[PDB]
Write a protein that binds this ligand. Structure first.
Ligand code: CLA
Ligand code: CLA
Ligand code: CLA
Ligand code: CLA
Ligand SMILES: CCCCCC(=O)OC\C(C=C=C1C(C)(C)C[C@H](OC(C)=O)C[C@@]1(C)O)=C/C=C/C(C)=C/C=C/C=C(C)/C=C/C=C(\C)C(=O)C[C@@]12O[C@]1(C)C[C@@H](O)CC2(C)C
Ligand SMILES: CC(=O)O[C@H]1CC(C)(C)C(=C=C/C(C)=C/C=C/C(C)=C/C=C/C=C(C)/C=C/C=C(\C)C(=O)C[C@@]23O[C@]2(C)C[C@@H](O)CC3(C)C)[C@](C)(O)C1
Ligand SMILES: CC(=O)O[C@H]1CC(C)(C)C(=C=C/C(C)=C/C=C/C(C)=C/C=C/C=C(C)/C=C/C=C(\C)C(=O)C[C@@]23O[C@]2(C)C[C@@H](O)CC3(C)C)[C@](C)(O)C1
Ligand code: KC2
Ligand code: KC2
Ligand code: KC2
Ligand code: KC2
Ligand SMILES: CC1=C(C#C/C(C)=C/C=C/C(C)=C/C=C/C=C(C)/C=C/C=C(C)/C=C/[C@@]23O[C@]2(C)C[C@@H](O)CC3(C)C)C(C)(C)C[C@H](O)C1
Lengths: 215, 210, 201
C-alpha cells in the first residue's frame, strides 16, 4: 500500500509523492503502515469534502440567501461573512447539527453495515470515503447521502476514478480557499486579492456555541 | 593533553606550568585526566569563540523581532543580559542545559562509534542528534550536512585550528569583559562599555541568592 | 569549459567558489548552479535596465491605463512603490510560477535536463505543453523567429547573453546607486528604496 501512493502522479504530475513530514510510515496507535496511510487518505478526503461544503456555505452566508418559511430567520440580516450567523443560531440547533454529523459518521464506519454492503473498513483494505447505504434498524429512510436520486448509478470505472482524483484535488484547493476566507476574516493576511472584502469576525472561528459549556 | 601540542604549536608545546595531567581527577585515572581537560579546553573555546563573535554583532545591531529588542544598544552587552526578562534567562540556560545533558549520554555517543571523552572517546564530539524521542529537521554540528565529506586531514587541521583559535578567543572575550567594569584594564581598547555589575551573575538584576 | 567569452581574461575567482561544495554537493553541480545564477542575474538585470530606461520617461502603456497613468510619474522606483499591492503580488506570484515550471524535472526531463545533478544547459525555460492549458506560445520565443537556427549561432548568443548580462548588471547597479549616491553620471531623480514597502510592514 506504500507503493499504492503512486496515485499522486495521477492527482498531479511533476509534483509526485510529496511528503516532507514523512507520515507515510509513522505508525499510528501501534497499527501497521497500510492502516496509517488509510487513515491519512480518509482524513484527507473528509477534510476536503467538508472544506468544499464550507466554502459554498461561506458564499451563501455572505450573500445572505435565507430559507423562505424558516422561523429561525431571526438572525440579523446584515451578518458577518459567516461566523456570526453561525453564532446567532441557538445552541440546540448547533448541537443537533453536530450530533447529526456524528451519527452519520458512526453509520459510515460501522463494520456490520460496511461488510453487509460488501466492503471493509478504510484501514482494513477498503476504499476511503465510501459511506455505505442504509440497511438500518427499522427505518425505510429514502435517499442515502451519495447520489440519492441516482445520478451516478451507472458509471464506468474510469469516470469514477477521474472523479475521485478530482474530488481529492478540489478538496485540497477548497481547504486552502476556505482558510484564506477565515484568515481574511481574522487578522487578514491574504492582502493578495483581499478575497473580496469580508468584514471581520473578531471572535474565534473555533469557538462553537455562545456559552462555553465548561469543555 | 599528550605531547602532540607540537603540531598545534612549535617553540612552545606541552608548556604545562601547573602540571595538571596526573592529579588523578576524582580517582579516575591519567587518561581520564587528559580526556576531561581536552574537552574543557575546547568547550571553553567553543563558547568563547561564539561569544566574541557574538559580541561584535550585538553592540551594533539587534534582531528586529520584539522581546530582546528596543532595549538600548549603546551600552555594554553584559548589561544587556541584565535587561532581559527572567524567563528569557532561564530558557537560555536550560536550552544549553539540554545540549550538555544530551551530549554526555554515553548510549547516544556509542551509536556513532565514539565513547564519552575521558573513557577513551574523542574530546569534542557532539552527537548527530538522530535518536531523540521526536524527530527534528536540523541537528547542531554541520546542520546542512555540508562539510562531513572532508578527509581526515581537513578534520585534523580543523581540530587543531579549533584549539588554537579557542585559546586566542578565551583571552579575547575575557580581557574584553574585564574592560566593561574596572575601566582601563586593556589599554589597547579603552574606548568601549560601562557598568560595574558582575558579568558572572546572570540573575543579579532580578533576585539574590540568599 | 574555460569560458571563452573574453579571451584575454581567463578564470577569475578570488573566492574559490569554483572548487566548492555548496550545500554539501559535488563540484560539477556547484559550477552549474553558479552558471545558472549568473545567467539569471544577468537576464533580470538586463530586463530591469530596460524597464528603468522606459520608466524614466513617461512611456506608460496607452491601451487603457486605468491605474498605470493614474498617479503622475515619479521616482522610477517609486513607480513601483506607488502601484497597488495586488499588482506587485500578482507579478511576484507569476514569477514564482514561472521559476517553479523552470525547475520541474518531469517537464524538464520531457524537454532537457536540470542544471544540477544532470547535464542541464544553463538557462532553459521549458515549454507549456504539460499544464492543462493550450497557451498560445511558450516563454522562450513566443512569436516564432529562432525556430530554425545554427548551433554555433546559439553558442555565440549564449556567450553574448552572459557578457551583456554582466555589463547590464554593472549598469543596473550603477543606476540604482546613482539613485541614492551619484557616482559618475548625471540625470537621476531620487531614491525609492528597493523592497516592496507601502503596506504590510
Ligand atoms: C459528536 C460528533 C462527532 C463524532 C463522534 C465524530 C467522530 C469522528 N470524527 Mg468527526 N466531525 C464532526 C462530529 C463528530 N465526529 C463534525 C461536526 C465535523 C465538522 C467540523 C467533523 C469533522 C471531522 C473531520 C474533518 C475528521 C473527523 C474525524 C473523525 C473520526 C476520528 C476523530 C478522532 O480522532 O477523535 C477525536 C476525539 C475527540 C475530539 C475527543 C472526544 C471526547 C469525548 C470522548 C471519528 C469517527 C476524522 C476522520 O474520520 O478521519 C479518519 C477527520 O479527519 N471529523
Ligand atoms: C457544510 C457547512 C455548513 C454549515 C456548518 C452551515 C451552517 C448553517 N447554515 Mg448552511 N449551507 C451550506 C453549508 C453549511 N451551512 C451549503 C453548502 C449551502 C448551500 C446549499 C447552505 C445553504 C444554507 C441556507 C440556504 C441557509 C443555511 C443556514 C444555515 C444556518 C442554520 C442551520 C441550517 O438550517 O442549515 C441548513 C443548511 C443545509 C441543510 C445545507 C447543508 C447540506 C449540505 C452540506 C449542502 C447541500 C447538499 C445538497 C445540495 C442538498 C440540496 C439542497 C437542500 C439544502 C435542500 C447554519 C449557521 C440558514 C441560515 O442562514 O439561517 C440563519 C439558511 O437559511 N445554509
Ligand atoms: C497565495 C499565497 C499567499 C501569499 C503570497 C500570502 C502572503 C502573506 N500572508 Mg498569507 N495566507 C494565505 C495565502 C497567502 N498569503 C492563505 C491561503 C492563508 C490561510 C491558511 C493565509 C493566512 C495568513 C495568516 C494567518 C497571516 C498571513 C500573513 C501574510 C503576510 C506575511 C507577513 C509576514 O510577516 O511575512 C513574513 C503576507 C502578505 C500574515 C499577515 O499579513 O499578518 C501579519 C498572517 O498573520 N497569511
Ligand atoms: C524588469 C521588470 C519590470 C518590472 C518589475 C516593471 C514594473 C512595472 N511596470 Mg514595466 N516595463 C519593463 C520592465 C519592468 N517593469 C520593460 C522592460 C518595459 C518595456 C517593454 C516596460 C514597460 C512598461 C509600461 C509601458 C508600463 C509599465 C508599468 C509598470 C508598473 C505596473 C510597474 C511599476 C506601467 C506603469 O505603471 O507605468 C509606468 C505601464 O504603463 N511597464
Ligand atoms: C515584448 C518583448 C519583445 C522582445 C523582443 C526580443 O527578442 O528582445 C531582444 C532580446 C532577445 C533576443 C535575441 C535576438 C538578439 C533578438 C535574436 C537572437 O538570434 C540570434 C542572435 O541568432 C536570439 C536572441 C534570444 O538572442 C534581448 C534583448 C536584450 C536587451 C534589451 C538588452 C539590453 C541591455 C542593456 C545594457 C547592456 C545596458 C546596460 C547599462 C550600462 C552598461 C550602463 O548604464 C553603463 C553606465 O555607464 C553609464 C552609462 C553611466 C555610468 O555612470 C555608470 C554605468 C555603469 C551605470
Ligand atoms: C493570491 C491567491 O492565490 O488567490 C487568493 C484569492 C482567492 C482566489 C479568492 C483564493 C481563493 C479561494 C478559492 C480558490 C476557493 C476554491 C474553492 C473550491 C474549489 C471549492 C470547491 C467546491 C466543490 C464542490 C462544492 C463540489 C461539488 C461536487 C458535486 C456537487 C458533485 O456531485 C460532483 C459529481 O461528481 C459527482 C459526485 C458524480 C458525477 O457524475 C457528477 C458530478 C461531477 C457533478 C485563494 C486561492 O485562497 C487565495
Ligand atoms: C572545509 C571545511 O570543512 O569547512 C571549514 C570552514 C568553516 C565552515 C568555517 C568551518 C567551520 C566552522 C566555524 C563556524 C568556524 C568559525 C569559527 C569562529 C567563529 C572562530 C572565532 C574565533 C575568534 C577569535 C580567534 C578571537 C580572537 C580574539 C582576539 C585576538 C582578541 O579579542 C584580543 C584583543 O582583544 C584584545 C585582548 C585587546 C584588543 O584591543 C586587541 C584584540 C582585539 C587583538 C570548518 C568546518 O571548521 C572548516
Ligand atoms: C459535500 C461533500 C462532497 C463533495 C463536495 C464532493 C465533491 C466531489 C467532486 C467534485 C469536487 C467529485 C468529482 C466527486 C467525485 C466522487 N465522489 Mg464526492 N463529494 C462529497 C461527498 C461524497 C461522498 C459522501 C461520496 C462521494 C463519492 C464520490 C465518488 C464515487 C467514487 C466511487 O464510488 O468509487 C466520486 C467519483 C462516493 C465515494 O465512494 O467516494 C470515494 C461517496 O459515497 N462523494 N465528489
Ligand atoms: C560555537 C561553536 C563552535 C565554533 C566556534 C567552532 C569553530 C571551529 C573552527 C574554527 C576555528 C574549526 C576549524 C572547527 C573545526 C571543527 N569543529 Mg568546530 N566549532 C564549534 C562547535 C563544534 C561542534 C559542536 C563540533 C565541532 C566539530 C568540529 C570538527 C570535527 C568534525 C569531524 O571530525 O567530524 C572540526 C574539524 C565536531 C567534532 O569535533 O566532532 C569530531 C563537533 O561535533 N565544532 N570548529
Ligand atoms: C558555573 C557557572 C558559574 C560560574 C563559573 C560563576 C563564577 C562566579 C564568580 C567568579 C568569577 C563570581 C565572583 C561569581 C559571583 C556571583 N555569582 Mg556566579 N558563577 C556561576 C553561576 C552562577 C549562578 C547560576 C548564579 C550566580 C550568582 C552569583 C552572584 C550573586 C549573588 C548575589 O545575588 O548576592 C555572585 C556575586 C547568582 C546571581 O546571578 O544572582 C542571584 C546566581 O543565580 N553565579 N560567580
Ligand atoms: C528577460 C530576460 C532575458 C534577456 C534580457 C535575454 C537577452 C539575451 C541576449 C541579449 C541580447 C542574448 C544574445 C540572448 C541569447 C539567448 N537567449 Mg536570452 N534573454 C533572456 C531570457 C532567456 C530565456 C528564458 C531563454 C533564453 C534563451 C536564449 C538563447 C538560446 C539558447 C539555446 O538554444 O539553448 C540564446 C542564444 C533560451 C536559453 O536556452 O537560454 C540560454 C531560453 O530559454 N533567454 N538572450
Ligand atoms: C526595483 C525596481 C526596478 C528594478 C529592477 C530590477 C529588475 C533590478 C535588478 C537588478 C539586478 C538583477 C542586479 C544584479 C545584481 C547582481 C550583482 C550586483 C552581482 C554582482 C557580482 C559581482 C560584482 C562579482 C564580481 C567579481 O568581482 C568579484 C567580486 C571578483 C572578481 O575577480 C570576479 C567577479 C567579476 C565575479 C527598476 C526597474 C529600477 C524600477 C522599478 O520600478 C522598480
Amino acid at each position: 500500500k506504500a507503493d499504492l501512493e503512486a496515485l499522486a502522479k495521477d492527482l498531479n504530475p511533476a509534483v509526485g509523492f510529496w511528503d516532507p513530514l514523512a507520515l507515510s510510515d509513522y505508525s499510528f496507535w501501534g497499527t501497521s503502515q497500510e492502516a496509517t496511510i488509510g487513515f491519512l487518505r480518509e482524513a484527507e478526503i473528509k477534510h476536503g469534502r467538508i472544506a468544499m461544503a464550507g466554502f459554498v456555505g461561506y458564499i451563501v452566508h455572505s450573500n445572505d440567501i435565507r430559507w423562505t418559511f424558516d422561523k429561525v430567520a431571526a438572525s440579523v440580516p446584515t451578518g458577518l461573512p459567516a461566523p456570526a450567523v453561525w453564532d446567532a443560531i441557538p445552541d440546540i440547533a448547533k448541537w443537533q447539527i453536530i450530533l447529526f454529523v456524528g451519527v452519520m459518521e458512526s453509520w459510515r464506519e460501522n463494520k456490520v453495515v460496511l461488510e453487509a454492503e460488501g466492503q471493509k473498513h478504510y484501514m482494513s483494505g477498503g476504499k476511503p470515503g465510501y459511506f455505505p447505504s442504509f440497511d438500518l434498524l427499522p427505518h425505510p429512510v429514502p435517499f442515502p447521502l451519495f447520489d440519492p436520486f441516482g445520478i451516478s448509478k451507472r458509471a464506468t470505472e474510469e469516470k469514477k476514478a477521474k472523479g475521485r482524483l478530482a474530488e481529492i484535488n478540489n478538496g485540497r484547493l477548497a481547504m486552502i480557499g476556505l482558510f484564506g476566507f477565515l484568515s481574511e476574516a481574522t487578522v487578514p493576511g491574504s492582502v493578495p486579492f483581499l478575497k473580496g472584502v469580508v468584514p471581520a469576525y473578531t471572535g474565534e472561528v473555533m469557538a462553537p456555541f455562545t456559552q462555553n459549556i465548561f469543555t | 593533553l599528550p605531547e602532540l601540542s607540537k603540531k598545534l604549536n612549535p617553540v612552545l608545546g606541552y608548556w604545562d606550568p601547573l602540571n595538571l595531567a596526573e592529579l588523578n581527577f576524582w580517582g579516575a585515572g591519567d587518561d581520564a585526566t587528559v580526556g576531561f581537560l581536552r574537552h574543557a579546553e575546547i568547550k571553553h573555546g567553543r563558547v568563547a569563540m561564539a561569544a566574541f563573535v557574538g559580541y561584535c554583532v550585538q553592540s551594533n545591531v539587534h534582531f528586529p523581532w520584539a522581546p530582546f529588542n528596543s532595549i538600548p544598544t549603546n551600552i555594554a552587552p553584559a548589561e544587556q543580559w541584565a535587561q532581559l526578562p527572567e524567563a528569557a534567562k532561564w530558557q537560555i540556560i536550560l536550552f544549553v542545559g539540554f545540549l550538555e545533558v544530551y551530549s554526555e549520554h554515553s548510549f547516544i555517543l556509542e551509536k556513532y562509534g565514539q565513547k564519552h571523552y575521558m573513557k577513551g572517546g574523542k574530546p569534542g564530539f557532539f552527537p548527530d542528534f538522530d535518536t531523540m524521542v521526536h524527530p527534528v529537521p536540523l541537528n547542531l554540528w554541520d546542520p546542512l550536512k555540508a562539510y562531513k565529506g572532508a578527509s581526515a586531514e581537513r578534520k585534523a587541521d580543523g581540530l587543531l585550528k579549533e584549539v588554537n583559535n579557542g585559546r586566542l578567543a578565551m583571552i579575547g572575550i575575557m580581557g574584553f569583559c574585564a574592560e566593561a567594569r574596572v575601566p582601563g584594564a586593556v589599554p589597547a581598547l579603552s574606548n568601549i562599555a560601562h557598568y560595574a555589575g558582575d558579568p558572572m551573575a546572570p540573575f543579579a538584576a532580578n533576585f539574590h541568592l540568599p | 569549459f574555460a569560458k571563452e567569452l573574453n579571451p584575454v581574461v581567463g578564470y577569475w575567482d578570488p573566492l574559490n567558489l569554483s572548487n566548492g561544495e555548496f550545500w554539501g554537493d559535488s563540484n560539477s553541480a556547484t559550477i552549474g548552479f553558479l552558471r545558472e545564477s549568473e545567467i539569471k542575474h544577468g537576464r533580470v538585470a538586463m530586463a530591469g535596465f530596460v524597464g528603468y530606461i522606459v520608466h524614466a520617461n513617461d512611456i506608460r502603456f496607452p491601451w487603457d491605463k486605468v491605474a498605470m497613468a493614474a498617479p503622475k510619474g515619479l521616482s522610477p522606483q517609486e513607480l513601483w512603490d506607488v502601484t497597488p499591492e495586488a499588482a506587485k503580488w500578482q507579478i511576484i506570484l507569476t514569477i514564482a510560477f514561472l521559476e517553479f515550471w523552470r525547475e520541474n524535472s518531469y517537464i524538464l526531463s520531457k524537454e532537457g535536463e536540470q542544471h544540477y545533478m544532470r547535464g542541464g544547459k544553463p538557462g532553459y525555460f521549458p515549454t507549456f505543453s504539460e499544464l492543462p492549458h493550450p497557451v498560445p506560445f511558450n516563454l522562450f520565443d513566443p512569436f516564432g523567429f529562432s525556430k530554425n537556427a545554427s548551433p554555433e549561432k546559439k553558442a555565440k548568443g549564449l556567450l553574448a547573453e552572459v557578457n551583456n548580462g554582466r555589463l547590464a548588471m554593472i549598469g543596473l547597479m550603477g543606476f540604482l546607486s546613482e539613485a541614492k549616491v551619484p557616482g559618475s553620471v548625471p540625470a537621476l531623480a531620487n531614491v525609492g528604496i528597493r523592497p516592496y514597502a507601502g503596506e504590510v510592514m
